[PDB]
């Protein structure tokens, strides 16, 4: 909801390292791999759950 | 797909004269009528055909 006002809607998905731990993810950002993918947001749905984000990978980066 | 990242996404609409010829469209820009109408973009669907774009009459121009 914060990035809606941004003139450029883009989202970046990364790849977590082994031993997934959301506590580590929130605590230490280094766990996530360097490689990532920035792309566009198509449409929010949130039918059954308030977060149902459809994700595409368009611009890979390291 | 190039205009998706534009701050102001807009699409024009022109009119071809007689002797309809896409080869002339790519060759002779003179085929396109100087009268036109620009508009904002609504959304892209592409149900069966890869290209299905909706155009509107928003701002007429001579």
Swiss-Prot record, chains A, B:
It is found in: Mitochondrion matrix. Duodenum, heart, lung and liver, but not thymus. Homohexamer. Organized in a ring with a central cavity. The ATP-binding and proteolytic domains (AP-domain) form a hexameric chamber, while the N-terminal domain is arranged as a trimer of dimers. DNA and RNA binding is stimulated by substrate and inhibited by ATP binding. Interacts with TWNK and mitochondrial DNA polymerase subunit POLG. It is linked to CODAS syndrome: A rare syndrome characterized by the combination of cerebral, ocular, dental, auricular, and skeletal features. These include developmental delay, craniofacial anomalies, cataracts, ptosis, median nasal groove, delayed tooth eruption, hearing loss, short stature, delayed epiphyseal ossification, metaphyseal hip dysplasia, and vertebral coronal clefts. Belongs to the peptidase S16 family. ATP-dependent serine protease that mediates the selective degradation of misfolded, unassembled or oxidatively damaged polypeptides as well as certain short-lived regulatory proteins in the mitochondrial matrix. Endogenous substrates include mitochondrial steroidogenic acute regulatory (StAR) protein, DELE1, helicase Twinkle (TWNK) and the large ribosomal subunit protein MRPL32/bL32m. MRPL32/bL32m is protected from degradation by LONP1 when it is bound to a nucleic acid (RNA), but TWNK is not. May also have a chaperone function in the assembly of inner membrane protein complexes. The Lon N-terminal domains are crucial for the overall structure of the protein, maintaining it in a conformation allowing its proper functioning. This is Lon protease homolog, mitochondrial. It comes from Homo sapiens (Human). The gene is LONP1. The chain holds residues 154 to 215 of 959 of the full protein.
């Amino acid at each position: 909801r914060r990035k809606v006002r941004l003139a450029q809607p883009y989202v970046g998905v990364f790849l977590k390292r082994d031993d997934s731990n959301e506590s580590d993810v929130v605590e230490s950002l280094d766990e996530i791999y360097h490689t990532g993918t920035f792309a566009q947001i198509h449409e929010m749905q949130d039918l059954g759950d308030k977060l149902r984000m459809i994700v595409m990978g368009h611009r890979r980066v390291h």
